Amino acid sequence: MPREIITLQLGQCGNQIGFEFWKQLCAEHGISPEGIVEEFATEGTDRKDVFFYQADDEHYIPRAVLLDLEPRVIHSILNSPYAKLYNPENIYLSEHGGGAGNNWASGFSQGEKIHEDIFDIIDREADGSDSLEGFVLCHSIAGGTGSGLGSYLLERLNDRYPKKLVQTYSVFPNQDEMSDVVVQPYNSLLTLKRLTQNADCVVVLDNTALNRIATDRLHIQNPSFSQINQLVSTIMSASTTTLRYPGYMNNDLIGLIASLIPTPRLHFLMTGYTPLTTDQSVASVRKTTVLDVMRRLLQPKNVMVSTGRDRQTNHCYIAILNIIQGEVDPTQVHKSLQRIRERKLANFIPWGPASIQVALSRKSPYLPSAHRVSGLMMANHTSISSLFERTCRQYDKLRKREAFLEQFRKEDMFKDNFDEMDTSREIVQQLIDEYHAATRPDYISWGTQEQE
Amino acid sequence: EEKELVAHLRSIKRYFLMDQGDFFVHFMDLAEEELRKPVEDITPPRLEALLELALRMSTANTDPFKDDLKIDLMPHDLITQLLRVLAIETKQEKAMAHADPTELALSGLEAFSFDYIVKWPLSLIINRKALTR
Amino acid sequence: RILTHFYQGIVQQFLVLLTTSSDESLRFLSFRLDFNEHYKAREPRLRVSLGTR
Amino acid sequence: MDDDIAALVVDNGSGMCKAGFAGDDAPRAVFPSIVGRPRHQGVMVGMGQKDSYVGDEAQSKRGILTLKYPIEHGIVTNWDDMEKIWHHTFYNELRVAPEEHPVLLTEAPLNPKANREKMTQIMFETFNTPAMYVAIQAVLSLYASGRTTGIVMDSGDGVTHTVPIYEGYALPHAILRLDLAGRDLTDY
Amino acid sequence: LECSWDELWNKVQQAQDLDHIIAAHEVFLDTIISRCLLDSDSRALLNQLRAVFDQIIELQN
């Protein structure tokens, strides 16, 4: 049976991303906005049970839970054409609707207050999952609901489901824009602290990078939350294609990620997408070669993760997994890997054997693909620590000025101290040190308390 | 038509006669660092992979006969191969044909040659003597 | 360390087999496995085989 | 045995195309005038599914094919798809080279002259047939009746025609077409 | 797997007779066996791979 995945969409940005992800999954699986499989979706070769539940013999309901401490985002999901697609028992809306006020501590306190209700909703969604693997959280780290309520929900899931994996897609605040939310760095720090203690994987979504991509590639001067949510839905669809296009390998998330995550602390993931094309260029399915794919993936413009320029740590790639979708020749993959090695197109870990993994995936048969070849890059790169160091520096910049800290001090999680911010800074420092060690042969002792 | 004589000639010009100067410039710019190694230090598989990668990354990727282009590692350096060619039209041809391949670990630039796989009966035209020349 | 040393010995024998293997793709896979030359740094036979041929 | 190269006989009924050899008592191939192309190009491409199936092959692949009818209401609506259907019939069911056999074609009453011209062009250039003829189906049925004067009522599935014929010549002023046939009765 | 399967499939798509299909399937199986280290020449390599798998299971335990 498929390993069902519960999708948690938290706060305004997270909830929009989750809603659009469920929409994208329905479109890829040929599920109508009401949750019914379309008559053209006759290829029963997809694993809906990983991401969808069957509502009836004909209706597939996404295994998605939309969670907010403010009712607006949940209502907006329920106000979409896909409102009938999701099982209503898997929809949790905070009764108070007030959100966390962009305070992570407030969101955590609200989650603790709604712990019973939230876990009842989670169990209701879980019962629709035949073999639920775990929860995927879509949220923002800068707000209150997606950061704070997300952290609280993660804590309560860890307490109730201590043997299940918890991955998060955490939207980080824009680091190049001065946030008007002076406590946004504080909220982000508290959320990152909780992700460090209670989450197993945090997917960092930098709103600065989303805005930059929309500006340079989508020509969007002011990227809306909706455009970011649509990009997230495209990313989620690409990430779930291997569930939707079953094959010989990588049929489960844990099998794919086991090779990428050696230690629990190195749980900061970077993403990549290829080929990057503007929406207008969908028409021409370019016969992209494996060498051309690898060359385009190496461009920072195509990487879906905004890692800071760490000047102190000799950041390197530990490992790379490329998930390629479309027509892929194995001999072309082999020749591409050979050329990459000869050209040193990929740097591997210095403490053990490492290479660039290449996965070939089929496209969804129910969704016509405008591109002959598509690709996801998974990479372990020490520069992802620089993103965490930058978040820590922003927290310290707010904390050192105590800016907007009174709003977090209003909430119990931050009422007495800002220890969650200091723990976030310490965790980001430890991540930087391990990431620098992971570029070195002494990585064999990286993460050992004697090396820490 | 069947032996693609004109296509074979265009491929030879592109690769053996360096007609695709932008392609050859790109290929040599990419491959110079690996080819600069001594032949004993040169990994033939690495040179072949770099050749194919430059070919796909250069304007040689635009050559329709590029798939007929193969890598040939000459047993002698470019200087010894050149001396053999200079002797070919001279009575020294027998002396240069019997000249042992230069013991000097030729750089990949000096070891670089093209090969062309010609099948029978088309191999009657691109003969081994012509291919060697 | 014991597992790594056993692996390195097996890898050296595997690299010899790869050089004797008919499949070129397996040789390219071996070359990828030591992209940072970590195993080549750890297994002397993998360092010598690539250097000599 | 003198292999007298048999002319081809193609009966294009409003519902079903029927084809065979001259001098046969019945067409050797009789299939619905439908051409089916795979509904999902993707999944069945690897299973050796043809991009399109014609006649009985379209019916056999109906589960995976989108069927199209190049003859609509007895009128040819897709000349390329009709030519593909005829080619499939010839090479798979009859297993004959149309370049080696004269082909007698049938036509609907009041078939457009330009449509006849396009069919003739396709037949002569694609199939390189040594000889061909185009006859009105009702006229052939009249000839089968041993008559030169009379009315032939040809009723297929897609269209009905009334064709008066006098002394071997059809009476065009008296030819009638009725767009009511087996399909309409089936829907009723 | 992919290379031997593609060679088998290409030959089958190009197969003109049943003997051609038989030969293509035999070639596919032999290619897979050699590439799976299951041939006689890989017998020492196969034993080393089996020892590696046993050491991997021992490491896991």
Curated annotation (Swiss-Prot), chain A:
The modification Phosphoserine is found at S131. One of its GO terms (molecular function) is microtubule nucleator activity. It is found in: Cytoplasm, Cytoskeleton, Microtubule organizing center, Centrosome; Cytoplasm, Cytoskeleton, Spindle. It holds the Pfam family Tubulin_C. It comes from Homo sapiens (Human). Component of the gamma-tubulin ring complex (gTuRC) consisting of TUBGCP2, TUBGCP3, TUBGCP4, TUBGCP5 and TUBGCP6 and gamma-tubulin TUBG1 or TUBG2. TUBGCP2, TUBGCP3, TUBGCP4, TUBGCP5 and TUBGCP6 assemble in a 5:5:2:1:1 stoichiometry; each is associated with a gamma-tubulin, thereby arranging 14 gamma-tubulins in a helical manner. Gamma-tubulin at the first position is blocked by TUBGCP3 at the last position, allowing 13 protafilaments to grow into a microtubule. Its main location: cytoplasm. It comes from the Eukaryota. This is Tubulin gamma-1 chain. Belongs to the tubulin family. Tubulin is the major constituent of microtubules, protein filaments consisting of alpha- and beta-tubulin heterodimers. Gamma-tubulin is a key component of the gamma-tubulin ring complex (gTuRC) which mediates microtubule nucleation. The gTuRC regulates the minus-end nucleation of alpha-beta tubulin heterodimers that grow into microtubule protafilaments, a critical step in centrosome duplication and spindle formation. GTP binds at A142, G143, G144, T145, G146, S147, G148. SMART domains: Tubulin (SM00864), Tubulin_C (SM00865). The lineage of its organism: Eukaryota, Metazoa, Chordata, Craniata, Vertebrata.
From Swiss-Prot, chain B:
It is found in: Cytoplasm, Cytoskeleton, Microtubule organizing center, Centrosome. Ubiquitously expressed. Changing A111P: In CDCBM15; uncertain significance. Belongs to the TUBGCP family. Component of the gamma-tubulin ring complex (gTuRC) which mediates microtubule nucleation. The gTuRC regulates the minus-end nucleation of alpha-beta tubulin heterodimers that grow into microtubule protafilaments, a critical step in centrosome duplication and spindle formation. Plays a role in neuronal migration. Component of the gamma-tubulin ring complex (gTuRC) consisting of TUBGCP2, TUBGCP3, TUBGCP4, TUBGCP5 and TUBGCP6 and gamma-tubulin TUBG1 or TUBG2. TUBGCP2, TUBGCP3, TUBGCP4, TUBGCP5 and TUBGCP6 assemble in a 5:5:2:1:1 stoichiometry; each is associated with a gamma-tubulin, thereby arranging 14 gamma-tubulins in a helical manner. Gamma-tubulin at the first position is blocked by TUBGCP3 at the last position, allowing 13 protafilaments to grow into a microtubule. This is Gamma-tubulin complex component 2. The chain holds residues 505 to 637 of 902 of the full protein.
Swiss-Prot record, chain C:
Ubiquitously expressed. Component of the gamma-tubulin ring complex (gTuRC) which mediates microtubule nucleation. The gTuRC regulates the minus-end nucleation of alpha-beta tubulin heterodimers that grow into microtubule protafilaments, a critical step in centrosome duplication and spindle formation. This is Gamma-tubulin complex component 3. It is found in: Cytoplasm, Cytoskeleton, Microtubule organizing center, Centrosome. It comes from Homo sapiens (Human). Transmembrane segments: none annotated. The gene is TUBGCP3. Coiled coil: none annotated. Belongs to the TUBGCP family. Component of the gamma-tubulin ring complex (gTuRC) consisting of TUBGCP2, TUBGCP3, TUBGCP4, TUBGCP5 and TUBGCP6 and gamma-tubulin TUBG1 or TUBG2. TUBGCP2, TUBGCP3, TUBGCP4, TUBGCP5 and TUBGCP6 assemble in a 5:5:2:1:1 stoichiometry; each is associated with a gamma-tubulin, thereby arranging 14 gamma-tubulins in a helical manner. Gamma-tubulin at the first position is blocked by TUBGCP3 at the last position, allowing 13 protafilaments to grow into a microtubule.
Curated annotation (Swiss-Prot), chain D:
The modification Methionine (R)-sulfoxide is found at M44, M47. Changing I71A: Decreased interaction with SETD3. Its EC number is 3.6.4.-. The modification N6-methyllysine is found at K84. Changing D81A: Decreased interaction with SETD3. Changing G74A: Impaired methylation by SETD3. It is found in: Cytoplasm, Cytoskeleton; Nucleus. Coiled coil: none annotated. The modification N-acetylmethionine is found at M1. Actin is a highly conserved protein that polymerizes to produce filaments that form cross-linked networks in the cytoplasm of cells. Actin exists in both monomeric (G-actin) and polymeric (F-actin) forms, both forms playing key functions, such as cell motility and contraction. In addition to their role in the cytoplasmic cytoskeleton, G- and F-actin also localize in the nucleus, and regulate gene transcription and motility and repair of damaged DNA. Polymerization of globular actin (G-actin) leads to a structural filament (F-actin) in the form of a two-stranded helix. Each actin can bind to 4 others. Identified in a IGF2BP1-dependent mRNP granule complex containing untranslated mRNAs. Component of the BAF complex, which includes at least actin (ACTB), ARID1A, ARID1B/BAF250, SMARCA2, SMARCA4/BRG1, ACTL6A/BAF53, ACTL6B/BAF53B, SMARCE1/BAF57 SMARCC1/BAF155, SMARCC2/BAF170, SMARCB1/SNF5/INI1, and one or more of SMARCD1/BAF60A, SMARCD2/BAF60B, or SMARCD3/BAF60C. In muscle cells, the BAF complex also contains DPF3. Belongs to the actin family. This is Actin, cytoplasmic 1. The chain holds residues 1 to 188 of 375 of the full protein.
